[PDB]
Amino acid sequence: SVDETIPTLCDRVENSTLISDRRSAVLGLKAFSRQYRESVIASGLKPLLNTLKRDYMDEDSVKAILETILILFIRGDGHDDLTRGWISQQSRLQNGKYPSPQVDQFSLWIADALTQSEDLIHLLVEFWEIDNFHIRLYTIQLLEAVMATRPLKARSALISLPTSISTMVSLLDDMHEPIRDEAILLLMAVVNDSPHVQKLVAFENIFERLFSIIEEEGGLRGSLVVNDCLSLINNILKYNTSNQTLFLETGNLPKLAHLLSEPISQDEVFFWNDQRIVNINTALDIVSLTVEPGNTVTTKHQNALLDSSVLMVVLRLAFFHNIPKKVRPVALLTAANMVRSNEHAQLEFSKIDVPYFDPSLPGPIKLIPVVSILINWMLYANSVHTFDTRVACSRLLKAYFMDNFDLQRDFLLKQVQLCNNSTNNVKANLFEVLLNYDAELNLNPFKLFFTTDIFMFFFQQDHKYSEELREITRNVTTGPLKAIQTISELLTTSLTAADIRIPISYLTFLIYWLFGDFKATNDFLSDKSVIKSLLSFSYQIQDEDVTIKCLVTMLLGVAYEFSSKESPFPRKEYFEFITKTLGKDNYASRIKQFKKDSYFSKVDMNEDSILTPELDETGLPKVYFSTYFIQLFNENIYRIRTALSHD
């Protein structure tokens, strides 16, 4: 009745004479496939698969068996015993861009069974030649299921039949739209992480076909199917430089440009929702994939991109007033990938000016150069939901300067003149923030974080003439007191106060500045008054958080490491001063503790962690250290622990 019924039905499936009584047993097995799934798989799968191989020509036979296998795939709680929604969600979760939020051993049993040889897979592919809508569509969905569970075998078996990817791509043209839609899902999966299937699709006019579908479905207005089309374009381009050249050299850039412009080029307002935000962010991400950083052709692709309207539409997206807060950063970051390290792009960038508005705020129209409005937002657009934008502003500027010394050196000199031109007269200045006391700096701590971060950017000692850029910053003049000593007073004032990010930002900046720089160490050592305050601060009762006490003692330590006997506080003496108070044993124990058990130990080594950062119990991002600081430390942890030890 469970175990007399299924074995008997399995029997008639294989051993009946006439194709009718076989098919009929399959219906009977189908009948038991929800309640007795695991038994039917066990007793029934091989016979189901054999009479499929055998009756492959009989449409009713094939339809009933594909229905039975899909039913069997998972034990679903849902209206669809074939679990078809689940299958599409897997295709998207596994291979799709920006997905929105079950499988067992028995699922895997069916997946293995269907990939034992390429026999079954080839057969499934041959079913796309059948005039039956339902067979063509079950075939796709069953392959989505196998692909969701044994991608490697399913893909291997697919590529070993040469036409499969052509006939797969040809399904975009199917008369019945459901087939077009699933086919996008299947191609997403089959193409993902497969240079071979990336090469194979590039031959099939896949970009022209997919843009066509997208324009037919309404571009950004246009729900999942557009999202899926953009997911497939993404998956075809990802880490495939030839695919990327072909994309760029095949008239796809006007069609991206048109798609990205819909919110802008409206006469009538473009309303947004979660879907339209995912669509345009994937569209923007696709631009980014062409300009893979660290790759031979990146500059060639950047120039390709600059040749088209794309930089202008991406930038109009970034500086349009009614752009969603979750799109603005992606626009800016994309603009970064186009401009980064490109003399012509960098130069082109410098010329563009923009109607000013404040993205962070819940009338004459004055225009300002982009560089100034990026700096302005990065420093003063202090709002919970602008933090992703501020970080992107950071990155666009770094991309704008990157590998262009003339622009850096030019930029600093105009920036000091603006600090010394407020002294000459008796908001986008990095020296203003770095060097002046702000009473309300705890209200907007990231202003300093971003400022120290970009200075550490310019100051990298591999930047060919870092020395030139340091010097200009070093001899800056508040009052008669030079940058480092003026920094140190703000540092020492800040230690006492309440927000923990401000000390960390200054402490790490000065450690960064001084490390390797004999002139910077002298300037720091020029006035003991500070060395005394830090040393006194180093003797505190920690209250169970210690990160600053370790940074303070590391700064004393690093400054000792670059001492020399010609220092305003000579090495041999400054040694005694730190040794007699703090001690060699405490010092190396504080450096060790900084790595092992501080906010630095909690650093997320993921280079893009800052784009999707954790919020704390304030609602403020858990961002503390600049990447430059982090590298410098990791890269030289030994020498620093060893500063006082050597002698």
From Swiss-Prot:
Top-rank taxon of the source lineage equals Eukaryota
Q: Where in the cell is it found?
A: Cytoplasm, Cytoskeleton; Cytoplasmic vesicle membrane; Endoplasmic reticulum membrane; Golgi apparatus membrane
Q: Where is this region: Globular head?
A: 1-647
Query: Repeat ARM: residue ranges?
Result: 31-75, 105-148, 151-191, 193-238, 239-290, 292-340, 341-400, 479-513, 515-559
Complexes and interactors? Homodimer. Dimerizes by parallel association of the tails, resulting in an elongated structure with two globular head domains side by side, and a long rod-like tail structure.
Tell me more from the record.
Present with 2330 molecules/cell in log phase SD medium.
The similarity annotation says: Belongs to the VDP/USO1/EDE1 family.
Q: What does this protein do?
A: Required for protein transport from the ER to the Golgi complex.
**Could you give the domain comment from the record?**
Composed of a globular head region and a rod-like C-terminal coiled coil domain. The rodlike tail sequence is highly repetitive, composed of a heptapeptide repeat pattern characteristic of alpha-helical coiled coils. May form filamentous structures in the cell.
For this entry, the protein name equals Intracellular protein transport protein USO1
Source organism per entry reads Saccharomyces cerevisiae (strain ATCC 204508 / S288c)
Q: Which residues of the full protein are shown?
A: 15 to 718 of 1790
